[PDB]
From a paper:
FtsZ is an ancient, filament-forming, tubulin-like GTPase protein found in the vast majority of bacteria and archaea, where it acts as a central component of the cell division machinery (1–3). Here, using X-ray crystallography of Staphylococcus aureus FtsZ (SaFtsZ), we reveal how an FtsZ can adopt two functionally distinct conformations, open and closed. The closed form is found within several crystal forms of two nonpolymerizing SaFtsZ mutants and corresponds to many previous FtsZ structures from other organisms. We argue that FtsZ’s conformational switch is polymerization-associated, driven by the formation of the longitudinal intersubunit interfaces along the filament.
Specifically, two SaFtsZ mutations, F138A and T66W, were designed to inhibit SaFtsZ filament formation on the basis of equivalent mutations inhibiting the assembly of Methanocaldococcus jannaschii FtsZ (M164A and T92W, respectively; polymerization inhibition of T92W [unpublished data]). Both mutation sites are located on the “top” surface of FtsZ, in the N-terminal GTP-binding domain, and are part of the longitudinal protofilament interface seen in crystals. For easier reference, the five SaFtsZ structures are named herein in the form #XXx: number (1 to 5), mutation (F for F138A, T for T66W), monomer conformation (O for open, C for closed), and finally the arrangement of monomers within the crystal (m for monomeric, f for filamentous, single protofilament and s for split/domain swapped). The conformational switch does not appear to involve structural changes around the phosphate-binding region of the nucleotide-binding pocket. We know that our mutations compromise filament formation, and we obtained crystals where these mutant SaFtsZ proteins adopt the closed conformation and fail to form bona fide interfaces. Hence, we propose that these closed forms correspond to the conformation of monomeric SaFtsZ in solution. The fact that the phosphate end of the interface is not formed in any of the F138A closed-form crystals supports the idea that it is the closed conformation that is not compatible with the formation of bona fide interfaces, not the mutation per se—because the F138A mutation is within the pseudointerface.
Author numbering: 13 to 201, 209 to 315
The structure:
Amino acid sequence: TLKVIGVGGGGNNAVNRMIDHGMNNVEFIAINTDGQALNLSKAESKIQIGEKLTRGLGAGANPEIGKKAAEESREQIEDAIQGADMVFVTSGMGGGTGTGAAPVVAKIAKEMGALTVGVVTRPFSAEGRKRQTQAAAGVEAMKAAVDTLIVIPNDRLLDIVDKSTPMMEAFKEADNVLRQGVQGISDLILDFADVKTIMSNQGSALMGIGVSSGENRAVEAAKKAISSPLLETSIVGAQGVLMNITGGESLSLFEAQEAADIVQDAADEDVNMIFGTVINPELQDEIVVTVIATGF
Ligand SMILES: Nc1nc2c(ncn2[C@@H]2O[C@H](COP(=O)(O)OP(=O)(O)O)[C@@H](O)[C@H]2O)c(=O)[nH]1
């Protein structure tokens, strides 16, 4: 039983990209201070927070607003999570809602016993350093709050998207990245207790994405993932690695083994590696290798 919660406008856009993209397994939850944004959210469940602080508007960008706003609506949050086994808290740090509220939403789910995984974006360093300063705090808030935290610095997406890609639209790929991050894990649900062993109380986790379509797609996707810009360090330091190989109908068993072997070689000699495949019909010909490394 899986529930992904979108905390903030950033998170809610990533949640709505997770919905627009066919994703059949999981419950979606939208959390914001802004009433407007919640209306545009595609999630089944929505939650407005700070209904007494904000009077039904947004948190207007200060992290102190969401923190207290979350506490105000702690009741409703605990209700929405009830009986989820694993919770994904997807949010953009730097904002008001996410920065303060999302860490509280997390520790709610951790205190409720669900496996809490945090998939959060850092803001672009091109977004002003004040917003970067707040995000740095919010990140450290979540590190305490979650079992595993996957922190994707948006700047590292500048090593992915075009220079032509507008700034206010570069978040659409950041959406897609959070999608692949959550979806990579969620799609594999392997033994749940195995995943627990990889995620439970591990802390800071790195993500690696690689996509390839060609002659050598298996090898080419795994190599790209092993050395994804999103990885702050190469994964050899990790004690636990989860790996996903998502492909079309044409996805070979051979290809899976090839990609698995490649990633295994890159990981520590005696790493706890667990990996699975996913046939996703909607995929044309590209396969996607998603690497989550834990424990640093
Ligand atoms: N993935 C994603 N990230 C975003 C989007 N818009 C903004 N962000 C990032 O998320 C951070 C917070 O934005 P926002 O969610 O509006 O703040 P909040 O509403 O106070 O939680 C910013 O620093 C942005 O870098 C979006 O549409 N998608």
